[PDB]
């Protein structure tokens, strides 16, 4: 079966919504997808929804013999790393832990997909309450509710459909929990400190109501220390050290969704570094290939907590062995060129491009915003918007929707400065054809 | 590091309750694992529970040179199939359609992991029911129940952990919905064809009175054709039946687990085919590597389901890509042995073995039972069933507990009738020791 007939062999079994290309897999390379059927290349501002931390094929990967070897013997056969170890497993483990480690934050649990982390971070969540609850006398049934944010996206499994909200489409019809949900106080145009403050104030009120009217049974509250599909919604820092403060006085875990945002996209390991908030636990995916929970801090209290007992979480695989070997070579990488301190340089550069373009464009080109490598503006219609992504593909840059009206940017952290350039190019180019 | 080193290592991460040995995953082979730290040989009647069909590094992998470049260039990247489609997406699609393919099932949609594959499985039912009400002149809120079994293991997501009741540890303080769970009618020895009738017939009664007073909420019933979790506990053709003519009766999807009974354990494609109930939808994984659903009969019915309507399913990946190139291989060697076949034939091998324990030791050796490769014992308590694993570890043959006095039997397809006379060998050694 060949690139031409991909779609129609699909199109029997599946509905077929995704690129009109065929992705070779062989000759993509870099910050360039190709496609198989024509083999025109595309600048790649998308990177499977920001999970390619390197790119395609990236050289430290397709040149090294030994990796080869070791990949191959990871990727022959799928063990279940829950009940059997191996070297291939350990040796990533430690890598994840000095590259990405927290020392607040030693335990660390895998599984496969992110919606799947951030409900294992809830989970820990529940029974930590539920014990921290029984131990203090008040009733273990307690605990069950989790605090969480407007425009939030968590995922898409049985608890985080109660807590993604942004399109309908992903959660109508659907059974949900009656979970408390504040405004999103998040940064825009044209509110200074004072403001902002007020914005702020308002959620952090309706946060402090839900607290006390649901006494003991918040177990935690969950946000994405900015928030990708809900439109690139940027907070700050504040805010969530008000929450942190907030969650400690209720006794409730804070946790960090960072599937989005971790793995140096930000310019550090996580972005909640940036923000100077400690959580008690970070969920991660995407980028690091293998999801998980990291977590720590106040969940030791609890001294039979899901991470002292054996059987409280699990899974048949405990994470894609194939995606360890992958990610502990990739981390090795990020270590050893230091593509966290390049990604916040190139960040800043992609920053600068998109504030001259609102200069240029001032009625248009809204709200350019961003920390590191994670950028975007936003058009004044939703049909401006999807006009802007259609001239882009035309022009072979392929970028990301994000809510009503927002274009982010997601490049690799190997992208370089003439690749954001071209980047900027197509949109200047397609800007006076979407007036 | 070093195997001696691994346990140390993971120690410091995570809780290492699993095996003593560490995986060799280069000199492991069919129906054995090598341990790292000895080089002893284990015979594997455990397969990762359950998710490996053909054992580890099966030859017609490992020595096909063409599929060691097909696998290299899927592993060094992991695309979103969801979004970007290749060859190597559309050779598994088009394998997995003619190998295990069933033509009322035609819409096909992959994830990573089981419980997720069976709570996709869920969601399409939800929308059903939603949408057929509505049709209907009925609410569209109503139709968010799930039927389900006593027993039941379908995973430990947020949707499942409400449907899975084997031990306490796995559901404890987890919040959950309220779903109607019925007495589950298996069978057991020393009950003829009136008793067992008289058994389904009351499972039947239960299942008829959930359908009454929560009128058109039950979205679903959701089983597992053999439940492999909560002790290898077989049904009869007769009440699968009976359960598809409620359901129809009451418009309500009848979704069968497959994850632990599927891909040739039983000796078909799905155990379902043997039992000659059709399903609207499937759920399946482990062996498929990649999971997901398979749906259509009254799926279709309802024109705008989830299927039919752009993201109201999805998740980053769509599967891996590593696992999906893995399968198709595995698929291509069931096809072309003869596989299913050769599970039908070794099955009654080791089914008749289990029959003639039964016979030497009647007191300890209780209930042999079986469908394909699929085959378990119990002992008289507890204690004993620990036991045995324990005795049989030290003579180096791996199984599984189940239940409360379970061992079962998940050998590869391709285990020989020396491999199963070795692992009954053993069996009958530690007997005497357990007594
Ligand atoms: C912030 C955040 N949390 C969890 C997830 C869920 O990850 P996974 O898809 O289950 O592996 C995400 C994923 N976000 C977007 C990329 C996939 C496409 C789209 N979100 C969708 O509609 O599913 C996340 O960003
Ligand atoms: C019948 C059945 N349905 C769903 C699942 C969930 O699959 P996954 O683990 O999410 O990929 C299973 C898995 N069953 C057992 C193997 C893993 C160990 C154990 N069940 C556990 O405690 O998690 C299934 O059998």
Known sequence: TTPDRVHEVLGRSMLVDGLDIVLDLTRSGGSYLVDAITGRRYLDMFTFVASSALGMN???LVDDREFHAELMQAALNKPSNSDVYSVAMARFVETFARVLGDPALPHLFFVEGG?????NALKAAFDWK?????????????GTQVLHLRGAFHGRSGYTLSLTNTKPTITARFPKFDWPRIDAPYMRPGLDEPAMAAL????????????????????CFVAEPI??????????????????????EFDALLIFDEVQTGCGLTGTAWAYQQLDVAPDIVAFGKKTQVCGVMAGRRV???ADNVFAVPSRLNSTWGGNLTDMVRARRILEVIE????????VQHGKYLRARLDELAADFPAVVLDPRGRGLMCAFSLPTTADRDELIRQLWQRAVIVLPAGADTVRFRPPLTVSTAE?????????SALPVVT
Chains 1, 2 share one sequence.
């Not at 940027?234 to 008000?242: G, L, Q, S, T, W």
């Open 58 to 60: 990236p050289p430290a």
């Open 115 to 119: 919606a799947l982390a951030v409900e």
């Open 130 to 142: 539920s014990r921290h609850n029984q131990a203090h006398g008040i009733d273990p049934a307690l």
């Open 200 to 219: 702020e104030a308002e959620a952090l009120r309706q946060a402090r109501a839900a607290f006390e009217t649901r006494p003991h049974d918040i177990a």
């Open 227 to 248: 928030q990708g599909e809900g439109g690139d919604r940027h907070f700050r820092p504040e805010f969530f050290a008000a929450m942190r403060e907030l969650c400690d």
């Open 300 to 302: 030791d209290e609890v």
């Open 336 to 343: 050893a060129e230091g593509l966290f301190e390049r990604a």
């Open 420 to 428: 954001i350039d071209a980047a900027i190019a197509a949109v200047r």
